[PDB]
Amino acid sequence: FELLHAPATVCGPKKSTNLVKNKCVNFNFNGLTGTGVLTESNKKFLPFQ
Amino acid sequence: VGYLQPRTFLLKYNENGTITDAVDCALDPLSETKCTLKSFTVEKGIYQTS
């Protein structure tokens, strides 16, 4: 199996929680972790990305 | 019908992430200068290639 090469579709026994903003808490999206404040962004991405 | 070849391109992204310009390297002596500087404006003078 690969790591960080495709969007999440398998994962494992990990239940998803809620979404909190304006806080410097940890996050996890498709295996990629980190630490930062989730705010608003005016820039948009692409549908195939 | 054309075949793809491994080359070097310098993608130029705008304010929306749309590729609008791509300069190919390893083809012309002028294009090889912009490949190292990673820019589109080359001033006058002597530069090093390889």
Strand order of the largest sheet of chain A: 1-2
The beta-strand count of chain A equals 2
How is the main sheet of chain A built?
2 strands, antiparallel
Biggest chain pair contact, residues each? A-B, 4 and 3 residues
CA radius of gyration of chain A = 13 Å
SS content category of chain A: mainly beta
Shape summary of chain A: extended
Spell out the helices and strands of chain A N to C.
EE
Strand content of chain A: 15-25%
Straight-line N-to-C gap of chain A: 21 Å
Helix content of chain A: under 10%
Number of helices of chain A: 0
Oligomer: part of a larger assembly
Protein name (chain B): Spike protein S1
Disulfide bonds (chain B): 25-35
Glycosylation sites (chain B): 16
Region (Putative superantigen) (chain B): 14-35
Short description:
This is part of a larger assembly, with two copies of chain A. The first copy, chain A, is mainly beta.
